[PDB]
Chains A and B, each alone.
Chain A
Amino acid sequence: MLLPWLILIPFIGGFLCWQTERFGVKVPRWIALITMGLTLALSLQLWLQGGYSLTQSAGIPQWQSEFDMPWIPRFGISIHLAIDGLSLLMVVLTGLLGVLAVLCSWKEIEKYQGFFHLNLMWILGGVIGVFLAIDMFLFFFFWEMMLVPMYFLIALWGHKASDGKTRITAATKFFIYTQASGLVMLIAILALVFVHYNATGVWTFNYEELLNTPMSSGVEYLLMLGFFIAFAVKMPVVPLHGWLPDAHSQAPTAGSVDLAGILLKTAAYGLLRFSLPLFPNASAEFAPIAMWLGVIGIFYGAWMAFAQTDIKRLIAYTSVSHMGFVLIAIYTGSQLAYQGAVIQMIAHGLSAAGLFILCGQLYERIHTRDMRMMGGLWSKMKWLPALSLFFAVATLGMPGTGNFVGEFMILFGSFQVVPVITVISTFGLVFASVYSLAMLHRAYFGKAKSQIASQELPGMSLRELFMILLLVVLLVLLGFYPQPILDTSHSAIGNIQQWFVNSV
């Protein structure tokens, strides 16, 4: 019931930020803040009223809330939303990151701020719709709908220091990758729908009805291959990964647009929700390839991030390595590894949000991003280097932050399933510590090798410090007490794991 409002409130809010620019340039930021606060409040109200902690696993489908409306009755297409523990967790994370993104661009008084805010809210609404839709056409619709505002934000409101041609090139590369992968996913969806139509005679796109689809061996492999191409481009999984550092480099200066659409794990959610229950045997056979791809992605992202002279590209390849960890977790078939994957995804979103916000604030202070131009910044900034030290400590898998709980439950489940990939991924954790230390010592420690890093810099504002400390508090509380997050998503993970291991 509240899910259509959960999707439409960002869209109506973005339309309001566009329309209320005539009353002032400082108005659409307040409107966007109000509507993301309303979205987050609705998500938290769904969390409180759901009773997710006391919910027990009953098998797919099992939704805490469900909405149906016919959209295209010729193909049996419905605007069909459904929320359970995992989807609610991702919706809450999306709302929190949207509030952080709206706050992160609070000092932009540009003449066209209203369209920027509409663009951001439409990205957030598309991400929420991806997390909520259980109709194949609607899920694909939101999946490709959240990319046009992404493209326009990167291309027009991107990094002003870089040339326009590089911004358009990076945005076009990102759009081409994501939309071609979405098209392949659509072809897999259509072939699955047609297989179900020949087997049954009923036109439908519903996830619940397409679950019991009798398919031969080889067709199911192709369908899961298309789904995995989409969910591996947007994860990212190597070699389908260059769009992520190219778009992070040319992202807008404040870093809000990084948090809005690039930083939310829609692809791994789709792997958990759509790839494994619909195609269990084919995913079971593709598990070694995906797990070795995750190992190669971890080490490729580590060696990439160590060799990066750009901070934003370093955080992008950190995201690549941690998403490789999640990809290893997803194809294990273990409840403990799945719960660790959920915790790791939430904690990695929080840590990368803190890292990108601190990098944006640092670029506001110093107007450069090259590691050969900073050094010894601890003595010049009041708050930024210690908070960045905390967040780089979080991204190396340090206990006390939720990332450690994430990768360690992932590796416990993986060692229960596959030990060699577990031990190689732990060496990947060593590599993660290596590049985090390299970034810390190239950025804030040492002696200054530039003139702009030889002067005293102004301290951070109250709102940026407040939101970064909020991220710090959330990461620490997730590291020390991850139990409410674990009990929130216990039923959905249980249903997915039981459906995966009971149909092989």
Chain B
Amino acid sequence: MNMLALTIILPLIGFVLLAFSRGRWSENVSAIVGVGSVGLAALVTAFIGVDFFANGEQTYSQPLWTWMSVGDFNIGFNLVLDGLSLTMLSVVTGVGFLIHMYASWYMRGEEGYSRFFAYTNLFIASMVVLVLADNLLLMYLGWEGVGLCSYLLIGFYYTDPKNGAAAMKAFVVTRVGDVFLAFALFILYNELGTLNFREMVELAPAHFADGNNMLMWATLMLLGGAVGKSAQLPLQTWLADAMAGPTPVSALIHAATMVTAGVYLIARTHGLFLMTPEVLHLVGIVGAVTLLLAGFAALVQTDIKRVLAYSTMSQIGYMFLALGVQAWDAAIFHLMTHAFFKALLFLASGSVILACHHEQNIFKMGGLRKSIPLVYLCFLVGGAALSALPLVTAGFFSKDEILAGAMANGHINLMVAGLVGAFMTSLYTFRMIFIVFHGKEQIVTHSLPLIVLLILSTFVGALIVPPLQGVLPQTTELAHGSMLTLEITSGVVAVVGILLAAWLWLGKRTLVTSIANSAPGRLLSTWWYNAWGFDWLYDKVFVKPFLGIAWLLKRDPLNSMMNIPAVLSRFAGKGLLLSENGYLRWYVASMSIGAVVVLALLMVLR
């Protein structure tokens, strides 16, 4: 339990060694160092969890040093470990270890092997800092390190400028989110005088007994930072474009590390959102709208990685809906299940891409079940877990807990949104599955993570529970009949979505090509393909005036404004030099003019 700092020391050592290797080591040694650092972090996490469960679920604290000490401003370098932190750390370390083994198989024969492994190790270390920090400033350190590693891993193939533009957009949107998080940090320190989470939940109701406006603003900017990092409304436009990295990069970003940070923000500071119910309802509304828009965008998407990204978007929207209905344990359980099956789906998608030896749209391939049976099985069970297939998959249990918490708290519009989102989720998931794996054919270091995520995306993942008792508040329990009919309705919605997908895309696409060519079909598909015009709006509202102001100011107008007196001095000197014409008669005339001027001035002023 005292080795809580080893979970960051080992990935930091791996990142430093792999950065200073500069590719001089062999690929075997670099892969061994990277995946061994992540595996050592996972083993230390396992020992920490064993000691945590053997100690009766007591919260552990390990201070290391004091970060800043300026008067009352005391920020410390302390790590904390409760059930939520243990769940986050175990998810990050295990899924990162599986992704690192897959990448050690996957990045073979590629340049920047050590660079990739160093960036992923720094990503793991920064996410561990994020999930282990006891104060908001240390968690901001992990937050911004996670954003930096996301930037460095998205634009991994730096030769293509489109990857660089994607990394630019990702880092700028996440930096706007981090600025909102900084806004919340400033407000919380100005109000309560501290940045420790327990100190917030201790002396927040005493300070905010009279006024609640500043706490409302703090929770609003916390929500803004959360949706900045979780790729939700209104800061979601970066994800689909920032697909540009390799497959393990997308798996790590979408499943394990990057987009769960906003959920960890909302769940960690749950008391402050509990005393501001309107902000929590706004979190739920934002999640519902995000999952609905993600489903409608994923329905018409033609790229497998892009529809997987919008599936991740809808899953994080479900998670934010669970947070907005005070279903915290359901949200963290959904984090576990969604991380498992989204990692499985992304690894299977990378296997599909490597089998097709090119990144193509889903309509190009078809009937790939005969070529790759194991990858087809992985994609099938990942789609079943994502579509909440009942009784076989853990995604059904996690989503059932989410809507049980939603309906048990009196939220009915969110219930309807969740049911429609589940129907659309099954629809787009098995639409993509049936397009990419059914039709007419045209064209040990990785099997183990695929098998582990194969097991964990089934009910074996639902057998694992997170130790969130005593950390997050308990959900209000639903009636047995209401829970039974909710499970029945969710399962019925799932199977009718499966049957509609089999009607619409497993056979010859007649009704799809019937509803496609119409002008409502063109406008709806154009709107949903371009993420409902959000990226276009942010290009026309934030990018284009920025470029216009840069082009208008590239000549430094203030420099010319302050250089104007130099031009005036030069012109005045040139004008005054005309009196030095060298004529003696003019000199005598000027002397007499000066005599007249001096005498007139003396007569006037006398």
**Inter-chain contacts of A303 with B (CB < 8 A):** 549-550, 553
Q: Can you list, as one digit per residue, whether each of B253-288 has a CB less than 8 Å from chain A (1) or not (0)?
A: 000000000000000000000000000000000000
Q: Are B179 and A429 in contact (CB under 8 A)?
A: yes
**Inter-chain contacts of A437 with B (CB < 8 A):** 151, 167-168, 171-172
Q: Are B559 and A242 in contact (CB under 8 A)?
A: yes
B603 interfacial contact with A, CB 8 Å: no
**Inter-chain contacts of B159 with A (CB < 8 A):** 376, 446-447
A202 interfacial contact with B, CB 8 Å: no
CB<8 Å pairs between A and B, sample of 14:
A239-B559, A306-B550, A307-B553, A335-B70, A412-B189, A426-B182, A429-B175, A430-B175, A433-B175, A437-B172, A480-B67, A483-B66, A483-B67, A490-B70
A486 interfacial contact with B, CB 8 Å: yes
Task: Report which of B22, B70, B77, B558 forms a contact with A300, defined as CB distance below 8 A.
Answer: B558
A184–chain B nearest beta-carbon distance, Å:
14
A443 to B533, CA, bound (A): 32
A499 interfacial contact with B, CB 8 Å: no
**Inter-chain contacts of B189 with A (CB < 8 A):** 412, 415
Q: Which 4 residue pairs across A and B have the least CB separation, nearest first?
A: A242-B559, A239-B558, A307-B554, A399-B141
Q: Which residue of A lies closest to B147 (CB)?
A: A398
A336-B73, A447-B159 given; A423·B183 CB < 8 A: yes
The segment from A20-28, A85-93, A271-279, A403-411 that touches chain B is A403-411
A418–chain B nearest beta-carbon distance, Å:
11
A303-B550, A306-B550 given; A430·B158 CB < 8 A: no
A416 interfacial contact with B, CB 8 Å: yes
A339 interfacial contact with B, CB 8 Å: yes
A335 to B71, CA, bound (A): 8
Q: Are B22 and A382 in contact (CB under 8 A)?
A: yes
Q: Can you list, as one digit per residue, whether each of A302-339 has a CB less than 8 Å from chain B (1) or not (0)?
A: 01101110000000000000000000000000011001
Given contacts A240-B562, A405-B68, 9 further A-B contacts (CB under 8 A): A239-B558, A399-B141, A408-B182, A426-B183, A430-B176, A430-B179, A434-B172, A446-B158, A483-B66
Q: Are B556 and A242 in contact (CB under 8 A)?
A: yes
Task: Report which of A307, A411, A480 forms a contact with B550, defined as CB distance below 8 A.
Answer: A307
Indicate the size class of the contact surface on chain B: 35 or more
B405 interfacial contact with A, CB 8 Å: no
Q: Which residue of B lies closest to A390 (CB)?
A: B19
A300-B558, A307-B551, A376-B159 given; A339·B70 CB < 8 A: yes
B155 interfacial contact with A, CB 8 Å: yes
B186 interfacial contact with A, CB 8 Å: yes
B563 interfacial contact with A, CB 8 Å: yes
A441 to B160, CA, bound (A): 11
**Inter-chain contacts of B67 with A (CB < 8 A):** 480-483
Q: Which residue of B lies closest to A239 (CB)?
A: B558
Q: Are A445 and B562 in contact (CB under 8 A)?
A: no
A336 to B189, CA, bound (A): 12
Q: Are B70 and A486 in contact (CB under 8 A)?
A: yes
Task: Report which of B68, B151, B161, B171 forms a contact with A486, defined as CB distance below 8 A.
Answer: B68
B148 interfacial contact with A, CB 8 Å: yes
Q: Are A393 and B148 in contact (CB under 8 A)?
A: yes
**Inter-chain contacts of A411 with B (CB < 8 A):** 182, 186
Q: Which residue of B lies closest to A309 (CB)?
A: B554
Task: Report which of A300, A393, A426, A445 forms a contact with B158, defined as CB distance below 8 A.
Answer: A445
Q: Can you list, as one digit per residue, whether each of B131-166 has a CB less than 8 Å from chain A (1) or not (0)?
A: 000000100110011001001000100110100100
A426-B179, A441-B164, A445-B158 given; A481·B186 CB < 8 A: no
B561 interfacial contact with A, CB 8 Å: yes
Q: Are B141 and A400 in contact (CB under 8 A)?
A: yes
B442 interfacial contact with A, CB 8 Å: no
B65 interfacial contact with A, CB 8 Å: yes
Q: Are B553 and A409 in contact (CB under 8 A)?
A: no
A446 to B66, CA, bound (A): 41
Q: Which residue of A lies closest to B72 (CB)?
A: A336
Q: Which residue of A lies closest to B554 (CB)?
A: A307
Q: Are B158 and A386 in contact (CB under 8 A)?
A: no
A502 to B436, CA, bound (A): 74
A456 to B187, CA, bound (A): 51
A38 to B434, CA, bound (A): 75
A446 to B190, CA, bound (A): 44
**Inter-chain contacts of B176 with A (CB < 8 A):** 430
B69 interfacial contact with A, CB 8 Å: yes
Q: Can you list, as one digit per residue, whether each of B323-340 has a CB less than 8 Å from chain A (1) or not (0)?
A: 000000000000000000
User: A interface vs B, CB < 8 Å?
Assistant: 238-242, 245, 300, 303-304, 306-308, 335-336, 339-340, 376, 378-379, 382-383, 386, 393, 398-400, 404-405, 408-409, 411-412, 415-416, 419, 422-423, 426-427, 429-430, 433-434, 437-438, 441, 445-447, 480-483, 486-487, 490
Q: Which residue of A lies closest to B152 (CB)?
A: A389
Which residues 162-209 in B have Cβ within 8 Å of A in the complex? Answer: 164, 167-168, 171-172, 175-176, 179, 182-183, 186-187, 189-190
Q: Which residue of A lies closest to B187 (CB)?
A: A415
A239 to B558, CA, bound (A): 5
A240 to B556, CA, bound (A): 12
**Inter-chain contacts of A434 with B (CB < 8 A):** 172, 546
Q: Are B562 and A242 in contact (CB under 8 A)?
A: yes
A486 to B73, CA, bound (A): 12
A437 to B172, CA, bound (A): 9
A411 to B140, CA, bound (A): 15
**Inter-chain contacts of A412 with B (CB < 8 A):** 73, 186, 189-190
**Inter-chain contacts of B164 with A (CB < 8 A):** 441, 445-446
Q: Are B141 and A422 in contact (CB under 8 A)?
A: no
**Inter-chain contacts of B71 with A (CB < 8 A):** 335-336
**Inter-chain contacts of A483 with B (CB < 8 A):** 65-69
Q: Can you list, as one digit per residue, whether each of B60-93 has a CB less than 8 Å from chain A (1) or not (0)?
A: 0000011111110100010000000000000000
Q: Which residue of A lies closest to B171 (CB)?
A: A437
A53–chain B nearest beta-carbon distance, Å:
11
Q: Can you list, as one digit per residue, whether each of B531-572 has a CB less than 8 Å from chain A (1) or not (0)?
A: 000000000000000100111011010110111000000000
A445 to B183, CA, bound (A): 32
A415 to B189, CA, bound (A): 9
Q: Are A481 and B183 in contact (CB under 8 A)?
A: no
**Inter-chain contacts of A419 with B (CB < 8 A):** 186
A239 to B22, CA, bound (A): 44
**Inter-chain contacts of A427 with B (CB < 8 A):** 179
**Inter-chain contacts of B144 with A (CB < 8 A):** 398-399, 404
A379 to B157, CA, bound (A): 11
Q: Which residue of B lies closest to A486 (CB)?
A: B70
A399 to B185, CA, bound (A): 15
B164–chain A nearest beta-carbon distance, Å:
4
Task: Report which of A238, A409, A447 forms a contact with B70, defined as CB distance below 8 A.
Answer: A409
A408 to B151, CA, bound (A): 22
Q: Are B161 and A446 in contact (CB under 8 A)?
A: yes
Task: Report which of A245, A399, A430, A487 forms a contact with B140, defined as CB distance below 8 A.
Answer: A399
A487 to B66, CA, bound (A): 12
Q: Are B190 and A415 in contact (CB under 8 A)?
A: yes
A306 to B545, CA, bound (A): 13
A212 to B151, CA, bound (A): 54
Q: Which residue of A lies closest to B559 (CB)?
A: A242
